[PDB]
Amino acid sequence: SDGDQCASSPCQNGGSCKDQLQSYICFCLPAFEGRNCETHKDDGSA
């Protein structure tokens, strides 16, 4: 028990969710962005 942030599968874009001490880290595709992988960065836009 140490903060279940990945247990909720927040990593979107079908990325791999991994626990990293309390916080978490999503392993989405290299063309995606956002803390929970909620931004598709293919060109960059802004």
Q: For residues 4 and 11, give the distance between their C-alpha atoms in angstroms, rounded to a whole number.
A: 13
DSSP string of 1-46, one letter each residue: ----SSTT----TTPEEEE-SSSEEEE--TTEESTTS-EE-SS---
Q: For residues 17 and 36, give the distance between their C-alpha atoms in angstroms, rounded to a whole number.
A: 9
Domain that holds residue 36: 1-46
Experimental method: NMR
Please give the tally of structural domains in the chain.
1
Q: Residue 12's domain is classified under what CATH number? A: 2.10.25.10
